[PDB]
């Protein structure tokens, strides 16, 4: 009957920002929005307004499991080494969405480090290596592993930007008493991750806009007018300091994803090809305790705020309620009557 479509209004409600709500990279609670000027690209769990995506990783933090790929360890002695596993891009047969990666693989560029030094930034997760042919894993290798994308493995390792021509790498950061080198081998890494750090302090918000890998054919965020794109922050645990409660003893680490997961779940099923007229964005109205803000949502899944050329984190501590408004064009500047 009549308009047999759904407006994109009820998926982003009041308790998505001051309560429950998680990111696309870690399953961390959203405490901030931080703008970036210049743009960024994310395509992992980023769903556009149609029923499609450009990437792997169905919206769920379950598991990373890969079966075929080569393993190695350096040194002539098979005692207290760093296990290094590699596969090429396009060998993931088990993933029904995209062949370029196993489901849940982090889309960051590998940093080249060697020796006993803990690497700065990155993506580490707890996991183990398992043999093929009705797999039972080896007992004497369970460790934290840093995964990512490289070129020229296992020799001169360089970070990669584009997924085409790249190869997925997985190097342990801690010592392990056994190292295998069998050609059929795989990984089993939990989906939720932490950030590896040399000492405490606070590196930067991770990722930076330039380190994020993109597949070919990805839509990029661009600042239109005085509006600029935002990125959702979450307080995540680190390896240099396990007790990273949001209090004293330096600023806690912030990890940033692209869009809220509730939005990814509620967008995946429905088609919104006519629900928002291109050239505009759908705008919500956040009301704090001492101000208010307008937040937009385009045809590509990106979120906009009219901060301009500022890189300051905006805290949803005093946020109370949101409210739908409708479509509004991109030439109109979203308001920035904040508490300051």
């Amino acid at each position: 009957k009549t308009v047999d479509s759904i407006s994109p209004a009820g998926l982003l409600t009041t308790p998505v920002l001051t309560g429950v709500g998680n990111d696309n990279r870690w399953n961390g609670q959203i405490v901030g929005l931080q703008p970036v000027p210049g743009g960024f690209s994310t395509c992992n769990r980023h769903w556009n307004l149609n029923g499609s995506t450009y990437g792997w990783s169905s919206p769920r933090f379950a598991d990373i499991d890969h079966r075929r790929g080569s393993a190695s360890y350096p040194g002539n002695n098979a005692t207290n080494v760093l296990q290094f596993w590699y596969a090429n891009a396009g060998s993931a047969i088990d993933n029904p969405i995209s062949q370029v990666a196993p489901d849940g693989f982090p889309d960051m560029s590998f940093v080249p480090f060697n020796g006993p030094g803990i690497p700065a930034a990155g993506w580490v997760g707890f996991g183990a290596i398992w043999n093929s042919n009705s797999g039972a894993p080896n007992v004497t290798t369970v460790q934290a592993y840093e995964l990512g994308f490289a070129t020229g493995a296992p020799g001169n390792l360089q970070p990669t930007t584009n997924t085409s021509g790249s190869q997925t790498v997985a190097k342990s950061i801690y010592a392990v008493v056994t190292g295998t080198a069998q050609n059929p081998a795989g990984l089993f890494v939990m989906a939720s991750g932490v950030i590896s750090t040399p000492s405490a302090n606070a590196i930067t918000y991770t990722p930076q806009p330039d380190r994020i890998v993109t597949t070919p054919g990805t839509p990029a965020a661009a600042p239109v007018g005085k509006n600029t794109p935002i990125m959702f922050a979450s307080v995540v645990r680190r390896t240099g300091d396990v007790n990273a409660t949001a209090g004293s003893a330096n600023g806690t680490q912030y990890g940033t994803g692209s869009q809220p997961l509730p939005v990814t779940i509620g967008l995946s099923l429905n088609n919104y090809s006519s629900a928002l007229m291109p050239g505009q964005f759908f705008v919500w109205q956040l009301t704090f305790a001492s101000g208010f803000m307008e937040i937009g949502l385009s045809v590509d899944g990106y979120f906009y705020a009219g901060t301009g050329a500022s890189t300051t984190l905006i805290d949803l501590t005093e946020l109370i309620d949101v409210r739908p408004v409708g479509p509004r064009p991109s030439k109109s500047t979203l308001v920035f009557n904040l508490g300051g």
Copy 2:
């Protein structure tokens, strides 16, 4: 709309059963419902019709962290041992809900084991040890640890049924070449969990109703008439076999939880004290490809189905849509028209 709170027909819709929507113990898709004859009692992430919880563990799979608790190891040599951590039930000062357990600690009674033989079922997790006083975690000890509740540690370790008068315990299932013995020590365990199985063929759904720990003062699910309580299964990986896929090469392990997590997320905020008159349940109508089954939701937060005295797992593969019905009393028997 400020008073006279709404009926809960919106928290359970059609994509919960055949799409997104996870469990309470594990983060997996709900592949079926299984009826337990006799009843059960889960009080970890359980919220009633009135908004209240009787227990710890806020509804989010984050991580498990503690600061106070002692670590020890057997053997005269500090090489290839099994670490042994314990703390008493009540030292969770940082927990703002209740003191009796740290946040995210599973409600599994401890299965006592000794030696290279891995235990039968349980809750293991990839984790590490860490020391207090601005201390980072130790590099050389990261392993899979099984967690639980014991009595009489570190001597004769016994499984525990009641949460009161107990102590939380954690020990490694594999070998690690180092052990620490400081009095202040703590865990860091990922919140997602798996089940350690020795031979791993068909086995048994975990946890059983005789293995779930309970806080004192819990409400207990009872079969009223022909309606039995049900409990939602999911596919969970095992330590013996990484490929725990729903296909060929052996039947799968079904990990079971009390109520779905979108239901707990939508019901941890709203209050439904006047929405449903007690003594009845809010019944829906699931429509499969060849039949229909009615599922009721009581005031305790439990789910009821009229399957009878059967332990057959009902597969949600052909389920299409869910239409709400509303309030219906406990004397009425739910239908079980199945193909």
